[PDB]
Design a binder for this molecule. Structure first.
Ligand SMILES: CCCCCCCCCCCCCCCCCC(=O)OC[C@H](COP(=O)(O)OCCN)OC(=O)CCCCCCCCCCCCCCCCC
Ligand SMILES: CCCCCCCCCCCCCCCCCC(=O)OC[C@H](COP(=O)(O)OCCN)OC(=O)CCCCCCCCCCCCCCCCC
Ligand SMILES: CCCCCCCCCCCCCCCCCC(=O)OC[C@H](COP(=O)(O)OCCN)OC(=O)CCCCCCCCCCCCCCCCC
Ligand SMILES: CCCCCCCCCCCCCCCCCC(=O)OC[C@H](COP(=O)(O)OCCN)OC(=O)CCCCCCCCCCCCCCCCC
Ligand SMILES: CCCCCCCCCCCCCCCCCC(=O)OC[C@H](COP(=O)(O)OCCN)OC(=O)CCCCCCCCCCCCCCCCC
Ligand SMILES: CCCCCCCCCCCCCCCCCCCC
Ligand SMILES: CCCCCCCCCCCCCCCCCCCC
Ligand SMILES: CCCCCCCCCCCCCC
Lengths: 478, 110, 100, 162, 297, 323
């Protein structure tokens, strides 16, 4: 299919982020200016976020065989852009202490955001593969941005090797699926079968290898072991981006693939994903019980929260509000992770060497940084699914979706993992208030971002109806 | 068609005879001529990162070159739309090249 | 008159050989070499599938695959050079200080 | 046409097996180059002419040139890890070999149950690939330019000398 | 770092002392074998400290030795370079590989029989090399040469100066990369050699100047050969200029390369064209005129 | 065994063998002609005593290099050391395998064509790298690394310089490229493509002024310095065969191939190819050698953008006249 002017209007955040990449790179070629290039990057990301309004006015349409733009794509584009803007905001005071080149960071963040937007709009195996790669490779650079530090270099090496392995797994699975199906469009994956022959062995094997790649990308058990090391070793704004934008974009494209593919309602794939979700919830909660590192603990937490999201994924064809539950949960998880990782980033700013990630460094945070401690305890309550937080609204959505589809093993897993999470999240939040032995407007902007995240988490925990109505508006093509 | 199979046979014989020809000259060079020994006959008569940078730039720009190779053989039936797409591709290419030159990535001399 | 199963089997054999080389080799260069083998095998599988269906999409996916392979090889070799600079040793077991 | 396919596939398999077990890195890269040439021959036997041309031009002419370049720069000689031959010890490779054999058996069993009319080997030209690339796959082309730009920026940031 | 510069480091004695024997000692294959072994393990046991080098092997610099591999008629010598990648951070030249003991031979030959040795001090110079020696001997003897001797010696000196300059310019062009003008410049050198062979009987080392004059009178017909060379030369020189010295690749290879000013030239004893390129007008033929050079425009 | 198809099969095989033998002998006798033409350019004679006009000088060199003692360094890696001259010969020989020298006289009428030439060029840079590393000489290794980086800096735009001709022809096939030059030769519209292809073809053949073993002789860092006998002869003859192949490719891509008004088509092809071979000699005789960084900066900063702009302008012109 060709590209029309209305298709170009539906292309608007992708085009704006690409133009921002080109403009920022040419500005770096002109002169290395940290403030100017950071400002140009955040201006481009804000312009894409604003142009989402024109995208919504355009309507839902297919842009080439590769992409389909609807309310679903708009919501995930907005989430990716919000995470990228927060990542740049946290990146500037951290990069102020960086002695080497700082301007390439925003270029890499912009290209990764471009990959996130592509994954939001992806309707095709080609676009899914390209969006995953377009997220991953800038993250190879960003995780090892402070490559003189041994932890950042080790995290970069681990992430690069394992993501290349997962990409080869995903591409081999895509090739097997294409060999069975003869079409790489999402709606055709299983369409050429009938009379109860959906469980074609090559199609299932291809989807299993794609599950290997995607479950690496979503930190799902047993493709999860990279998560605490890469989360700890990466720079703290990079950890923010990797926790929010990459996970949200990859889960959104997984949502769309399982909604559109006729093989998505196969019972074998459903049982395999149920096993993966159960193991992810239980394992991610259990491994975070005895973590003295806040970044590793947040990595195991991310494993458990993606397990809850996968539980919502399993009831996609059974129930009616699986996509709405996923949208509400992902908005709440984005805000909670933005606040927690942003407090970590502000505590590690400016960059001086090793990250401030020990729990002893956050012991007694209230006595010198009271606002940051209040934000961090709000986020620990939100990630525990405590009421008057948006995390509880997401957990309630997950539980309702599981109860409707009679996924009782998954519901019990969510309850048990919630209790374990209660233990370690409360441990962090109350260690904030114990007793233990900046000065520029960009650091204040980062503090304002984490404060706004805390206020949004509390307000939408008490009053979740605006977020619920927004997510219900953002519906894909049936 | 017998013309294409004749050309396939001719191509196979060309490759085989060329490889066998260089093998035969190497064998004749090894076999012929006397050999002598000397005491110091056996005696033979850290590179910077710019080497890797140049090879890496070559690899990346060769992949973009393959994209333009695919475009250039089908320009007429891709129309002006394909021209606009390839112009965007080439502009991103030239912006990357300008960025590489301006930051000293392609400056061997200090 | 080439069965699609035979091309897919050849691609799978190359893929598992590359995965074996990725697992059993401590040296980071041989890990990257195994990664190149696996991504080349997946690209071959896409080419076989595209040739079976008479479509250009297999070769287009091959093109995207080798673009990924080139960029990933570039990044992995840069990281290998950094590891050799800061460690004088390419043993991947040495980069293990983050655990638990 | 199938003669070339089976012999090139066998050569690629054997060369890859020599790659993953070899000690000398330059020799291993040479066997990898041989396997890529054989894979290009496989591509040409299937009618994917552009894929085979790019297999030698880009994979066996750029990427492995970069690998060879890095190996020659590092001056890899009598390395301690190289001298040990730990991967040749049965207790090291017997586990991963069984794991890969199990994965191969499962994938082959899935492969053998698919519908197969055979590949006719009708040549899909580079012109048709170029038409498809700048038609339905335009966004793939532009975002692949962005992907390789990201690889360029990352590799320059990491692989600098300073 | 006060080390030997002419003799090898494992040399016994000081040859210019009056009790050191001038003549060659008996050759021995054993010492040749030993010095070959020192050459073979010179790189293996190289330490920067004995050469005056420092801060090497930082562990980023390399030490690289140059040898007798580019013989552009200058001779054999070594340079050890300390390199940061491609950049020279320090280098010392290793010389004395062309040491002939010429001053010691000056104590070994008569005043007359030393003139051929003066010829081989700077072997592209010939009678130019002969001139200061015979002038200094004539100062010792109290000899004032007549005007014809002065003009003949000036003419021979200028012919050999043109010969040496032709070799220098052509070899510079060859070193830059243009391999053609050396053939033509050596043809011009052959025209000079036609005149020099006719006058002195020899090509490169004429040994023709004498204490008190020159060895013979000018042969009849010298002016014809001089006129032929003076007609031949200017078109060839203009052709070399246009073909090579005005090429922008040669200019980009040579302009701004190894630049120094007047102070650096003065502090290192640089003379000739290297000194005068810094703007210092110091030529001996004008500042301290000799051999009747003051009568020439 | 009497059938027209079988007779045509041996006719095509015999034509391919004739093309191969003529190309190899033309490369060797062009080493000899390089000596003679440098003599012509430098007001001298060159070799004119061994045979009539020096015509047996090549045979004397071949006998001398055959009966020179075969030497492999003991600390060298034998397989790679032996393999590098084989690639330096065969890469540009098989690149010639696509060149149509006359209507009906072609070895392989491939659908890829200059793509096959690009494949062969990549294998040629492998020959240089292998020769440098296998000699177990760190100077040869450094010189081969510099030569290979130069070769990559020009191979990065070699194919892009050919893409304007490909775009005008609308095909990768070499005979279609010739037939598209039936009215106007490609040197007029693809002039910048012609000059960039000529520069890149000289550079990938390691000819002056891109010859690394002659560029830096004081460092003694040439990657040929451990080769001797028939392996050095393989390097020499492969370099001259590469010059012949690059000249023939330039003739068939920018100068109409075999097309001409009066003479037979092979006569026109041979005359144009011999003219470009002679221009290779004159380039060697006349131009000085730029610095290494200057050469690579010229390749990256000037020639590659020129090829990209030339391709874009060629496409705009082609679509403009496509009414
Ligand atoms: C310093 C500079 C600062 C600049 C400002 C930065 C912050 C503010 C950013 C504002 C972004 C605005 C985006 C607006 C998107 C919706 C636009 C719109 O009009 O949507 C309406 C459309 C359905 O309505 P209608 O127009 O009738 O549809 C016709 C098409 N069939 O609706 C749709 O089709 C779908 C509607 C929902 C799509 C998702 C919403 C956008 C992304 C939100 C991400 C965050 C969500 C979670 C937080 C919510 C908090 C309340
Ligand atoms: C020391 C030895 C190392 C190894 C050297 C090589 C080993 C093998 C030698 C024997 C080769 C036998 C002949 C191969 C087949 C030739 C014919 C052929 O390829 O035909 C297929 C195809 C036809 O295309 P076309 O004419 O357009 O037809 C359209 C529809 N019929 O045409 C094509 O598909 C053309 C494209 C493929 C051409 C491949 C040519 C060889 C490539 C490898 C070069 C190796 C160089 C030396 C080693 C490098 C370093 C290892
Ligand atoms: C001889 C016994 C074995 C000896 C040791 C191994 C030597 C090398 C063996 C592999 C290479 C040669 C394989 C045989 C090719 C013979 C030609 C052939 O099969 O042609 C058929 C077909 C022609 O094309 P098409 O138009 O489709 O015709 C179909 C029939 N009308 O052809 C095609 O479609 C494709 C033609 C082949 C592809 C091009 C050549 C690829 C060469 C890859 C070499 C890899 C490295 C080898 C290293 C060897 C040493 C380890
Ligand atoms: C059959 C094969 C031959 C076919 C004939 C046509 C093609 C010839 C191919 C020859 C290739 C040689 C390439 C040489 C490139 C040199 C570029 C370079 O680095 O030049 C450096 C020089 C100065 O650079 P800069 O940085 O300014 O230095 C200042 C520092 N002091 O910068 C300069 O001097 C600027 C100009 C550089 C050279 C421009 C290109 C000249 C190409 C050669 C002349 C060809 C003329 C036509 C021949 C007849 C054709 C029928
Ligand atoms: C119509 C397109 C025309 C070509 C545009 C792209 C050319 C790229 C060539 C290149 O590498 O240029 C590098 C050059 C660096 O210039 P610089 O180092 O600042 O020089 C100072 C003194 N001359 O930079 C330039 O010459 C700048 C060229 C324009 C940059 C902005 C547009 C990029 C697309
Ligand atoms: C210094 C630490 C080195 C760690 C090496 C890790 C190697 C792992 C090898 C795993 C082998 C698995 C063998 C098959 C297991 C059973 C089948 C799969 C599970 C059902
Ligand atoms: C440098 C030139 C290399 C050429 C290699 C191939 C030579 C092939 C010779 C073919 C001769 C016959 C051509 C067809 C007939 C037309 C010409 C007749 C008179 C020769
Ligand atoms: C660790 C979590 C344990 C949860 C146990 C849930 C058991 C559900 C059993 C459902 C049986 C349904 C029979 C029809």
């Amino acid at each position: 299919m060709t590209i029309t002017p209305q298709n170009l209007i539906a292309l608007l955040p992708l085009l704006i982020v690409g133009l921002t990449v080109v403009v920022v790179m040419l500005s770096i070629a002109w002169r290395r200016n940290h403030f100017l290039n950071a400002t140009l990057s955040v201006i481009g990301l804000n312009a894409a976020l604003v142009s989402l309004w024109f995208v919504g006015q355009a309507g839902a349409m297919d842009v080439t065989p590769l992409m389909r733009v609807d309310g679903f794509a708009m919501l995930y584009t907005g989430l990716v852009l919000l995470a990228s803007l927060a990542t740049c905001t946290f990146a500037y005071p951290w990069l102020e202490g960086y002695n080497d080149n700082k301007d390439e960071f925003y270029l890499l963040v912009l290209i990764a955001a471009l990959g996130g937007i592509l994954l939001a709009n992806a309707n095709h195996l080609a676009s899914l593969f390209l969006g995953i790669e377009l997220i991953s490779l800038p993250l190879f650079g960003l995780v090892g941005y402070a490559f003189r530090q041994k932890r950042s270099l080790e995290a970069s090496i681990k992430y690069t090797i394992l993501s290349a392995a997962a990409s080869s797994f995903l591409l081999f699975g895509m090739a097997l699926v294409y060999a069975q199906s003869g079409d790489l469009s999402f709606v055709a994956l299983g369409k050429n079968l009938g009379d109860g022959m959906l469980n074609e062995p090559l199609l299932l094997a291809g989807f299993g290898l794609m599950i290997v790649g995607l479950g690496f990308k979503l930190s799902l058990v047993p493709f999860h072991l990279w998560t605490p090391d890469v989360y700890q070793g990466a720079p703290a704004p990079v950890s923010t981006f990797l926790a929010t934008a990459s996970k949200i974009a990859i889960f959104g494209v997984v949502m769309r693939l399982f909604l559109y593919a006729p093989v998505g309602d196969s019972e074998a794939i459903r049982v395999v994903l149920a096993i993966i979700a159960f193991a992810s919830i239980i394992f991610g909660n259990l491994m975070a019980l005895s973590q003295t590192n806040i970044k590793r603990l947040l990595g195991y937490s991310s494993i458990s929260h993606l397990g809850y999201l996968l539980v919502a994924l399993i009831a996609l064809q059974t129930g009616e509000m699986s996509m709405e539950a996923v949208g509400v949960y992902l908005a709440g998880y984005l805000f909670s992770s933005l606040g927690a990782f942003g407090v970590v980033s502000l505590m590690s700013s400016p960059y001086r060497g090793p990250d401030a990630d020990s729990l002893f460094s956050y012991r007694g945070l209230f006595w010198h940084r009271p606002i940051l401690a209040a934000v961090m305890t709000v986020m620990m309550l939100s990630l525990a699914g405590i009421p008057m937080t948006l995390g509880f609204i997401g957990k309630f959505y997950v539980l309702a979706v599981g109860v409707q589809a009679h996924l009782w093993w998954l519901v019990g897993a969510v309850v048990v993992g919630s209790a374990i999470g209660l233990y370690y999240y409360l441990r962090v939040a109350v260690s904030l208030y114990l007793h233990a032995p900046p000065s520029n407007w960009q650091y204040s902007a980062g503090g304002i971002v984490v404060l706004i995240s805390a206020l949004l988490v509390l307000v939408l925990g008490v009053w979740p109806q605006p977020l619920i109505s927004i997510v219900r508006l953002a519906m894909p093509l049936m | 068609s017998t013309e294409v199979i004749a050309h396939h046979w001719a191509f196979a014989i060309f490759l085989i005879v060329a490889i066998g020809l260089c093998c035969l000259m190497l064998v004749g060079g090894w076999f012929l001529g006397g050999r002598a020994r000397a005491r110091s006959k056996n005696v033979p008569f850290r590179l910077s990162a710019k080497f890797y940078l140049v090879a890496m730039f070559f690899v990346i720009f060769d992949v973009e070159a393959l994209y333009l190779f695919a475009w250039s053989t089908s320009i007429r039936e891709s129309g002006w739309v394909g021209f606009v797409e390839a112009a965007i591709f080439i502009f991103v290419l030239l912006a990357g090249l300008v960025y590489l030159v301006r930051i000293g990535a392609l400056d061997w001399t200090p | 008159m080439i069965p699609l199963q035979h091309g897919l089997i050849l691609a799978a054999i190359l893929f598992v050989l590359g995965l074996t080389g990725l697992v059993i080799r401590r040296n980071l260069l041989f890990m990257l070499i195994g990664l190149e083998i696996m991504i080349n095998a997946s690209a071959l599988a896409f080419v076989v599938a595209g040739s079976y269906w008479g479509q250009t999409d297999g070769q287009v996916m091959y093109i995207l695959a080798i673009s990924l392979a080139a960029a990933e090889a570039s990044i992995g070799l840069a990281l290998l050079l950094q590891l050799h600079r800061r460690r004088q040793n390419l043993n991947i077991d040495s980069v293990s200080e983050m655990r638990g | 046409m199938e003669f070339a396919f089976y012999i090139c596939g066998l050569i690629a398999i054997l060369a890859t097996l020599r790659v993953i077990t070899h000690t000398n890195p330059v020799h291993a890269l040479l066997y990898l180059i041989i396997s890529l040439l054989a894979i290009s021959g496989v591509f040409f036997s299937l009618g994917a002419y552009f894929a085979g041309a790019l297999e030698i031009i880009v994979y066996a002419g750029a990427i492995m040139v970069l690998f060879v370049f890095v190996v020659m720069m590092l001056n890899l000689g009598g390395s301690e890890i190289e001298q040990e031959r730990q991967w040749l010890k049965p207790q090291v490779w017997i586990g991963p070999a069984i794991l890969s054999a199990i994965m191969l058996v499962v994938i082959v069993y899935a492969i053998l149950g698919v519908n197969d009319q055979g590949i006719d080997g009708t040549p899909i030209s580079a012109k048709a690939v170029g038409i498809t690339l700048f038609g339905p796959y335009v966004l793939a082309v532009e975002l692949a330019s962005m992907l390789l730009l990201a690889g360029l920026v990352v590799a320059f940031h990491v692989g600098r000398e300073e | 770092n006060l080390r030997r510069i002419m003799m090898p480091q494992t040399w016994k004695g000081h040859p210019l002392r009056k009790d050191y024997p001038a003549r060659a000692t008996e050759f021995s294959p054993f010492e040749l074998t030993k010095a070959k072994q020192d050459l073979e393990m010179e790189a293996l046991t190289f330490k920067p400290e004995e050469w005056g080098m420092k801060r090497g092997t930082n562990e980023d610099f390399m030490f690289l030795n140059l040898g007798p591999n580019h013989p552009s008629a200058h001779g054999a010598f070594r340079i050890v370079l300390q390199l940061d990648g491609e950049e020279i951070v320090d280098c010392v030249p290793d010389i004395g590989y062309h040491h002939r003991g010429a001053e010691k031979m000056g104590e070994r030959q008569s005043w007359h029989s030393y003139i051929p040795y003066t010829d081989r001090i700077e072997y592209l110079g010939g009678c130019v090399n002969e001139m200061p020696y015979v002038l200094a001997v004539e100062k010792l003897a109290g000899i004032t040469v007549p005007d014809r001797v002065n003009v003949i010696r000036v003419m021979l000196s200028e012919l050999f100066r043109i010969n040496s300059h032709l070799l220098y310019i052509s070899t510079f062009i060859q070193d830059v990369g243009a391999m053609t003008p050396v053939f033509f410049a050596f043809t011009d050198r052959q025209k000079i050699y036609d005149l020099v062979e006719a006058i002195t009987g020899f090509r490169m080392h004429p040994a023709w100047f004498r204490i008190g004059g020159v060895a013979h009178d000018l042969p009849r017909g010298w002016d014809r050969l001089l006129r032929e060379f003076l007609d031949w030369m200017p078109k060839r020189l203009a052709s070399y200029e246009k073909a090579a010295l005005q090429n922008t690749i040669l200019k980009g290879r040579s302009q701004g390369v190894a630049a120094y000013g007047a102070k650096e030239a003065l502090e290192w004893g640089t003379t000739g064209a290297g000194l005068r390129a810094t703007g210092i007008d110091f030529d001996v033929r004008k500042a301290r005129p000799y051999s009747g050079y003051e009568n020439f425009d | 065994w009497i059938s027209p198809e079988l007779i045509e099969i041996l006719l095509t095989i015999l034509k391919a063998v004739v093309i191969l033998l003529v190309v190899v002998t033309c490369g060797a006798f062009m080493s000899f002609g390089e000596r003679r033409l440098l003599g012509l350019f430098q007001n001298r004679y060159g070799p004119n005593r061994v045979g009539w006009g020096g015509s047996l000088q090549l045979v004397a060199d071949m006998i001398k290099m055959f009966f020179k003692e075969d030497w492999i360094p003991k600390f060298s890696d034998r397989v790679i050391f032996t393999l590098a001259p084989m690639i330096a010969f065969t890469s540009l020989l098989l690149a010639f395998a696509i060149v149509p020298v006359s209507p009906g006289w072609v070895v392989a009428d491939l659908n890829i064509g200059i793509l096959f030439f690009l494949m062969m060029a990549g294998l040629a840079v492998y020959a240089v790298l292998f020769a440098g590393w296998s000699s177990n000489n760190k100077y040869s290794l450094l010189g081969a690394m510099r030569a290979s980086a130069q070769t990559l800096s020009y191979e990065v735009f070699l194919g892009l310089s050919l893409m304007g001709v490909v775009a005008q022809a609308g095909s990768f096939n070499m005979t279609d490229i010739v037939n598209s030059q039936a009215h106007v030769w490609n040197v007029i519209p693809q002039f910048f493509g012609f000059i960039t292809f000529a520069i890149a073809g000289v550079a990938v053949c390691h000819r002056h002024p891109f010859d690394q073993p002659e560029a830096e002789q004081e460092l003694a860092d040439g990657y040929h310095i451990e080769y001797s006998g028939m392996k050095f002869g393989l390097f020499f003859v492969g370099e001259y065969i590469g010059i012949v192949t690059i000249s023939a490719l330039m003739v068939t891509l920018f100068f109409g191939g075999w097309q001409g008004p009066l003479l037979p088509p092979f006569i026109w092809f041979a005359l144009k190819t011999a003219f470009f071979m002679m221009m290779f000699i004159l380039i060697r005789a006349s131009l000085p050698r730029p610095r290494y960084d200057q050469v690579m900066s010229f390749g990256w900063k000037i020639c590659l953008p020129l090829t990209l702009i030339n391709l874009l302008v060629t496409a705009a012109v082609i679509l403009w006249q496509a009414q």
